[PDB]
């Protein structure tokens, strides 16, 4: 049979071994018959990538200049996986995605189909209660859920598998009463041990209404993650942070066991950690510990960071997100070569009313990235396009969402604005409410170049 399911979408099929040529041909036939635009096949085994720099430029020239929308692979073992998955934010999905995508006749979510073995939560739709955690915790838990392959949502549905609460005291458990209430160690455990959560430890992570105090909470955290991981092989640079010493801002006020976790994460990768206090004298802290070369803070406008930048003018200025990005890439990387979301957060630019936005054709890590951007711009995002929405953000002109929202924008009353993701990124980069109707933000043909992939604006 035929269809237009894949129209204007480019695919890259990776063939790990000659024994895969049948399923590669089979998947490419499925892709062509359902109207893929460009549908390339590339044989990993037939070219000694040993000793050739398979970096971003290499990938861009070899497989470009148009963007690759999906990389089809049953393994992540190829030398440009990190380039594709963590930098350019292109989904990497098993052949099984193409078959199911055809039978279901829709763009299936990619998470479930990632071949990364670290993506232990690929199948979870997790809702993190904002009534339970402060900003810096919410961010950190969101980052690690994303690094573990799960999906974040912003309301509870029948598709929600897990709800993160800090304690029974939180007003989300009251106002609700088939999903599960869990403590954040359910996330942290999978991250730290790189294996599923089973046994008593599985039950230690579920909400217990008899946890009325704080000492019990501490106790359950210490047993689950206090004290030998599986899949040792997965993140093998155990010296990632060697000779680096991080100063931790007080403006992340973590739950103390969560600070322990973050401290042990750094230390297990051979780095050092000094926590800062509001009542520290900072000239003395950086003279006592002269090896301190990094600052970890929540907010760009903190006074602690201001004095620190004057004392230590070449210090690396990052947020907690930047730590885990370095871990994903397995290389220490100055913030200036990472992404906009890895710097200490700007003051909130927009309000909900000015910025309540829907999006379309953003898949996998791109979806997480557009939501993080809206968040730190100070607005809201939604999975479905309604009239509440103030903007629709689009990358192309394909699909029923752009069609409907493009119509509503012709009406003088509604006044909804269709524009591309580079408006988000440029607003944040410049820290200014730019006009989404400028011509550079009305380019709906970004798929013609891989450099216009969301998340590229701001790297060096």
Curated annotation (Swiss-Prot):
Record's comment on post-translational modification: Phosphorylated by MEC1.
Compartmental location: Nucleus
Source superkingdom: Eukaryota
Residues bearing the modification Phosphoserine: 279
All copies of domain BRCT, residue ranges: 1-102, 116-191, 235-327, 344-428
Summary of the function given for this chain in its UniProt record: Required for resumption of chromosome replication after DNA damage, specifically in S phase. Is recruited to chromatin in the presence of RTT109 and RTT101 in response to stalled replication forks and acts as a scaffold during DNA repair.
Additional notes on this entry: Present with 1380 molecules/cell in log phase SD medium.
Quaternary context: Forms a complex with the cullin-RING ligase (CRL) RTT101(MMS1-MMS22). Interacts with MMS22 and RTT101. Interacts with histone H2A; requires H2A to be phosphorylated (gamma-H2A). Interacts with RAD55.
Name this protein carries in UniProt: Regulator of Ty1 transposition protein 107
Source species: Saccharomyces cerevisiae (strain ATCC 204508 / S288c)
């Amino acid at each position: 049979s035929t269809s237009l399911l894949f129209e204007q979408l480019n695919f890259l099929i990776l063939v790990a071994a000659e024994a895969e040529l049948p399923i590669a041909h089979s998947t490419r036939k499925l892709l062509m018959d359902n109207s893929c635009n460009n549908c390339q096949i590339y044989e990993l085994y037939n070219e000694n990538l040993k000793d050739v720099k398979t970096d971003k430029d290499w990938f861009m020239n070899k497989f470009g200049p148009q963007t690759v929308h999906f990389v089809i692979s049953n393994t992540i073992n190829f030398p440009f996986y990190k380039i594709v998955y963590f930098d350019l934010l292109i989904p990497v999905v098993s052949h099984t995605w193409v078959q199911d995508s055809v039978k279901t006749k829709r763009h299936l979510r990619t998470n479930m189909y990632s071949p990364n073995p670290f993506h232990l939560l690929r199948d979870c739709q997790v809702y993190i209660s904002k009534s339970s955690f402060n900003k810096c915790e919410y961010i950190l838990y969101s980052d690690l859920l994303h690094l573990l392959g799960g999906t974040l949502v912003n309301y509870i549905s029948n598709r929600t598998t897990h709800v993160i609460v800090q304690s029974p005291q939180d007003p989300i458990i009251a106002t609700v009463s088939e999903w599960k209430f869990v403590y954040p160690i359910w996330i942290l455990y999978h991250f730290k041990m790189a294996k599923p959560l089973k046994g008593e430890l599985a039950t230690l992570c579920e909400l217990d209404m008899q946890d009325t105090s704080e000492e019990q909470l501490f106790a359950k955290w210490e047993e689950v993650i206090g004290d030998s991981s599986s899949q040792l092989t997965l993140h093998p640079n155990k010296t990632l942070f060697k000779n680096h010493h991080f100063a931790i801002s007080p403006d992340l006020n973590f739950f103390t066991p969560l600070y322990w976790f973050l401290k042990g994460f750094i230390e297990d990768l051979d780095g050092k950690v000094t926590p800062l206090s509001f009542s520290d004298d900072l000239k003395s802290v950086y003279q006592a510990f002269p090896d301190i070369d990094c600052y970890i803070g929540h907010s760009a406008n903190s006074p602690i960071l201001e004095k620190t930048k004057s004392i230590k003018p070449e210090i690396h200025v990052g947020n907690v997100s930047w730590l885990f990005y370095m871990f994903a890439l397995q290389k220490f990387t100055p913030v200036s070569q990472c992404k906009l979301i890895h710097q200490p957060f700007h003051a909130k630019l927009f309000t909900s009313k000015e910025l309540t936005v829907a999006y379309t054709n953003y898949f996998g890590s791109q979806r997480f990235y557009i939501q993080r951007l809206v968040e730190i711009l100070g607005g809201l995002s939604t999975p479905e396009l309604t009239r509440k929405n103030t903007h629709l953000i689009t990358k192309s002109t394909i699909g029923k969402k752009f069609k409907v929202a493009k119509k509503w924008s012709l009406d003088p009353q509604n006044a909804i604005i269709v524009t591309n993701h580079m408006w988000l990124e440029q607003c944040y980069m410049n820290n200014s409410k730019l006009n989404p109707k400028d011509s550079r933000f009305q380019n709906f043909k970004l798929d013609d170049n891989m450099g216009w992939n969301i998340g590229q604006i701001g790297m060096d």
